[PDB]
Design a protein around this ligand. Structure first.
Ligand SMILES: [Hg+2]
Ligand SMILES: [Hg+2]
Ligand SMILES: [Hg+2]
Ligand SMILES: [Hg+2]
Ligand SMILES: [Hg+2]
Ligand SMILES: [Hg+2]
Ligand SMILES: [Hg+2]
Ligand SMILES: [Hg+2]
Ligand SMILES: [K+]
Ligand SMILES: [K+]
Ligand SMILES: [K+]
Ligand SMILES: [K+]
Lengths: 453, 463, 463, 453
């Protein structure tokens, strides 16, 4: 590991057109000094592999503002207007990649795996191809489909970069590195997938400061190391400590000892109604197990945010891990319940909830496992529940239950919808008229429940 | 995470014929109490996914001794006589799987990846099929492994390997907090960590249970989500397999010059490891141990001996300041990815274009390839072979023993010569021992070779 | 084989929304009686797999006029105004499919092949998706074609195409014996033969029914096993679309020198075909017609005019002694396989490295690629482009119009110059018109180019 | 087309190690003069792509005898002892390839198709790989599997040769060529799959002798043409015009207007009991539709043989076509009934009937379609009907009915076996004891029928 005192010297040889991996989730764990150095060198036509686009004037945004990026390989690109502008204008190329797929492709890129199969994106424009990468001048190409154990998977190829720009917490004098809280995300796997990895840290410590069992990134993967000069500790979303109907029914999906992942909005609100006698472990795809409530203004930590990029806290016994690890945890079905909002759901369980053009985030990986119960919360109606979806799919035959303010439906990939709960006041015919496809009625149809909390 | 006070209660429902993942590298990090429990329940016909076979009367060996295993999916199975006996007798089925492939298939089994491509095993019986899973009393092969599909990426060949998932995982860990979070001690981690994510029911036995909060959240090795059943092991024998306390010399002394300051190297047992003793103290060399260590140090003083710290040869060792420990999948991701600069090992035969044969002899050596096939699997890693020159030619046109890798050896160091190997142009003699002439080498080698225009006497380290 | 005396009874059970394969090339070999029957039954929302759209009031046109078609899977759809109208209006759906790909997908649909790889369409909207299937009244594209998977073999790119199977096949044939064996006359064969094997229910209409035994068994074009329903057509109009009876001249006269004795060539409409008129009678050139003819002769005298014999441009033609006729799949197997030595055609733009753009203009030319994409799909076939030099540059760095093929043009002949094209080194000027200098060409061309050290004046055939 | 008067001049430039396509089915339509010329030139280390191995001293046999072949790509190699000897001895390499796959791979080789999918061999050692190609020193590699429309197919690659040695009937002076009766087989597609095709014919005729609609191989595919000097018109099998129980029940599988393909032995015998008031069209995979009975000694024609290589005749209205065409006809399910003998059949319909090492012939293609009813005839028992087969599979879940001398079972891929007919004298328990897996009993169980003819 070579130590540098100046950031620019550390990245001065990145070439025009190079593929650069840039760590960070939102504004959490971004290599702000190395990004600042790239502004100075002026290197351009970069293919930036980065989970998000930062914001308008920070993180990758600064580099979009300077016209230094030709293409981005990202999973979520919202909250960046200049980004959206260049993209919808044919000025910038963008490969929207499922978040889990992105993380796994990077890990494969450093693990000697040229390609692997994943369920994520099967049945959507990721597999099918055809999304614009550039204005159309370039479209995404399809992904091969192959079946295993009676299920469809698509082939994804490893992503390797010429350089990796990584933000980390500490480095000992030998080049060993660790990451703080949720600032880890993509920084860790990105560290092993480029020919030259450049790491910027907040502090350099003595060799011996780390228990050897606890080194997040061993020195072997750290080629260049610099102590970042300035850390703005920017926080994107400061969050300090009919719809109610959906929320109160979604609250009953929780079961003691359950591992759940809650999407932004109604599902996360639901968690506020969890009985304190019930223990629910909330997973955050950016790498956290054990989300707690929003912080008191003074507990606010820029290294701890949820997937919605909001400042949060964690409960006792929580853990942090990398983005590849997080989606291995999700893809592998270890999370018991995935609950999220949705635009349309199909009679057999297709979900449409990421495009009408910010990207799918981790949505496609969250509904990719059959071992994980997927529950959708959404306002009932224009029909949002039909025969076939009309909006781009997030997954196929992947939703198990729908909760609207009118009804609760269990979803089955073959037999369709079954109404199991009905709101007091409505009759089966009201639901019929408000739904765009037939459905069975449970012989045990009850009034829609509401949590008592 | 459900806590149990009795091991038997924790594994009593494993069914006959179940596929059980058993952690451990050698006798390091084995779940000896859960293994003891399986002796009690008597469950049988098990497909045991275990890196090694333990030893004759410990670890998986106890379960081979009780006839509780039908098949093993392992990478190295030496040092277990009863094991060998059942195998050569058609009593036990065995899938010799490259160590890195084993680790990666298990991780895939927990990561939702049904299959992936790896270089490891390309061009050998792993890809070709023909590896013996079950022998006839002595009529050769009764069940042979099936071939692996081949496909090319970026001008290189890779083979398709499928995920391995178990019904149960028997994992040894160091500590668990009251919430079920788990950590591993030193090199005892190895396969315990990925196995923890690849079975429907993971059962973890630990040496100590601590308060929630005893772990910094950043440093939990296995989050509670992967831990379904937890028990505090009742007895820990802390057994040590190999107690190692602190012509050939020619090879050793020339191999010593392969080291370069700041180099990451992986040294196989024997000559390559001895070479490391001649490293100048003014040179910093980082030694990687495939069982999950970066920074091997010298052998321990008898009182520094730790059962949780062993090298890939299963010998007690130490680590240098700044060392790290990580899991088996992580270790082979590091090796398959080419992050290690130099792989140095012994070999039985090497081919004119670089094929290596160093893990199986007809029906005389059948302990498995270990991590050898992964170590020579990357083009980004320089592979150097150390071996006595002849026998009978060990350097020929084509190998005759099962290959470890194809066109993967870059240099050969014998006590007579040093050859650089090129996948297309063949061998080039670059060093020659004082006293021999090019013709002596010619006569001792089984295929033509160029002679460097800068042919020097064979160097020897001065240390 | 069931015989019917009435066409309507033979197709009365076709269901609304059915996928129906309709044979014919232009107005050659169309099942006009079965089409007439479909008018009577009124069946609708049909997906019509038909090479062409017939003309305004004949062939598939009658069925577009009656609104009986929802979608068409065709390769060339020009000369049908009502067709164009429904299409540009969002009334009719259309999958423009390369002709050779259409033929091959149909054959696969009857041969038990669900999918195969072909070169045709690689690098264009066929592979990329983006081809318009359905237009908005005028808001561009309402439904765009989906991309085709790409995969490499032997260092070349190919795309995956799936079989096409129909519920019904409406086939025009020449004769049927009493057993149901069928034959086709001259070039009227085209798609009728493979379509006969790709539908659950094939319905064949013939001009004559003959005794069993009238065919030598070696010469039955479609064996009775593929013929489920047979009817003798009641009326045959024998309609002829194009009656053809027996600066630019510069291009023509230089293109004439591309012919070499014993050469197999395919000449596109216009300049390339005219060039063939200057072939020395001492030279034997075999002209291939993608609609299934080998050995085209000159245009017929008015009384030699035969509705069953037309060239790919749909013009009445003749054949020379020793000619052969074969099906559309066979024809494109011959072309995709590179058996034709020279493909010569007109073009709108060609790129520095050989990309060709010659089948679509923004939203001004949308009749389809015909067999153009298959003709330039093989590396074994020399592709020569004939075109006026400028417009506005027709030879640039990159094309701006939809591509027909990538790096597939080998030579360009304009009235000013002749350039040989190389996929890597670009353009090389090899011939120059008397009067112009290298700088004149430079100024008229949109990208650099080498100059042959053997640059000659542009040749002209003496005939 | 270049005409030669001497065979040797026509093949003198074939190089050592070249891949040569050699036409012929058995001894029918073999290029005996060109093969004789190869003996003279002595060219060696050839990869011979040939459907069969000829016999011991004729056809490809002559070239195996001279040690001029290094490898063969064939579908059936029986009736050639020297062949078997070199193979079992590690002297000769052999890729056993399903006949239909062979024909299609050759056609793809001339049609610009590098690869395609076929059902044939799915679930057997063709897909799985591992068969010895050479002694083990070389094993067959697996074939990729991919699903389409809910069915599995394997990927097969095109076969192209450096040269094709083709036997044909006539050539006009322009190089157009035709084939006689069943002597066509592989000669026709082989003609389009090599860089240099050499054709030997029995007669050269005037241009104009062929109707242009009837040219089997257009001149474009014929690069070199020679009139063969000597034609021995050799006939391999001269066939001139408990078990009876199976035969008499198999005879009832025929239905008027049916297209059937009958394997050697019991199925073909069954055809002798076809009522003359019923019209049954028999397909022969070597390229014939309309097989008739065995010929009178004087009707014997070496160009007309059945798949069993026996001299036969054809009925009025018969047709001849090429090997690729024949298997397109079979793979595509146009044949209604495939009836054959078998060693073992599985509870769910797996068939094992080609290896215990002569090759699978067309067997794997005949049971490859779901549109074709597959009926197996075999002696009942050691159990030949079990849970799983123990011998190499011909197809998976592909047998629909089994006829033994004891019982008749209908086979279903999911529910298993159902006894529908029972021989007079036996009881359900007799069958139970003679069968290696459970089975349902039809509620309409009848005594086993017997044709009355
Ligand atoms: Hg399956
Ligand atoms: Hg509605
Ligand atoms: Hg290779
Ligand atoms: Hg020797
Ligand atoms: Hg390319
Ligand atoms: Hg210009
Ligand atoms: Hg499916
Ligand atoms: Hg039995
Ligand atoms: K699910
Ligand atoms: K290497
Ligand atoms: K070309
Ligand atoms: K069937």
């Amino acid at each position: 590991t070579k130590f540098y005192t100046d950031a620019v010297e550390a990245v001065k040889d990145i070439p025009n057109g190079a593929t650069v991996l840039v760590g960070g989730f939102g504004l959490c764990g971004i290599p702000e000094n190395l990004i600042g150095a790239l502004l100075k060198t002026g290197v351009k036509e970069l293919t930036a592999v980065s989970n998000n686009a930062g914001v308008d004037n920070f993180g990758l945004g600064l580099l979009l503002q300077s016209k230094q990026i030709k293409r981005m390989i990202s999973s979520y690109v919202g909250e960046n207007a200049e980004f959206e502008r260049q993209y919808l204008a044919g000025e910038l190329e963008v490969e929207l990649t499922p978040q889990g797929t992105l993380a796994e492709r990077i890990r494969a890129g450093g693990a000697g795996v040229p390609a692997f199969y994943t369920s994520t994106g099967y049945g959507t424009l990721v597999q099918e191809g055809g999304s614009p990468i550039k204005y159309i001048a370039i479209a995404s190409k399809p992904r091969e489909v192959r079946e295993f154990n009676g299920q469809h998977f698509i082939l994804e190829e490893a992503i390797r970069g010429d350089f990796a720009l990584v933000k980390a917490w500490k480095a000992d004098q030998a080049g060993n590195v660790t990451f703080r809280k949720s600032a880890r995300n993509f920084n860790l796997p990105m560290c092993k997938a480029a020919e030259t990895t450049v790491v910027e840290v907040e502090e350099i410590v003595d060799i011996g400061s780390f228990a050897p069992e606890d080194i997040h990134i061993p020195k072997i993967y750290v080629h260049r190391l610099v102590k970042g000069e300035k850390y703005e500790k920017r926080i994107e979303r400061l969050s300090v400590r009919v719809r109610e109907r959906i929320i109160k029914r979604a609250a009953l999906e929780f079961e003691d000892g359950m591992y759940a992942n809650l999407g932004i909005g109604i599902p996360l609100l639901a968690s506020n109604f969890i009985s304190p006698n019930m223990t629910v472990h909330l997973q955050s795809e950016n790498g956290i197990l054990g989300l707690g409530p929003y912080p008191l203004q003074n507990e606010v930590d820029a290294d701890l945010i949820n997937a919605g990029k909001e400042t949060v806290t964690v409960l006792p016994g929580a853990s942090y891990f990398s983005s590849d690890e997080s989606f291995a945890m999700i893809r592998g079905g270890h999370v018991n319940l995935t609950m999220l909002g949705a635009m349309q759901v199909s009679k057999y369980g297709d979900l449409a909830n990421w495009m009408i053009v910010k990207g799918m985030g981790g949505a496609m990986d969250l509904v990719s496992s059959a071992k994980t119960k997927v529950v959708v919360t959404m306002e009932h109606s224009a029909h949002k529940i039909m025969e076939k979806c009309t909006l781009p799919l997030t997954g196929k035959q992947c939703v198990n239950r729908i909760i609207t303010e009118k009804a609760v439906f269990d979803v089955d990939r073959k037999k369709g919808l079954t109404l199991i709960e009905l709101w007091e006041g409505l009759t089966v015919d009201d639901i019929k008229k408000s739904t765009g496809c037939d459905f069975a009625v449970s012989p045990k149809l009850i009034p829609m429940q509401q949590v008592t909390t």
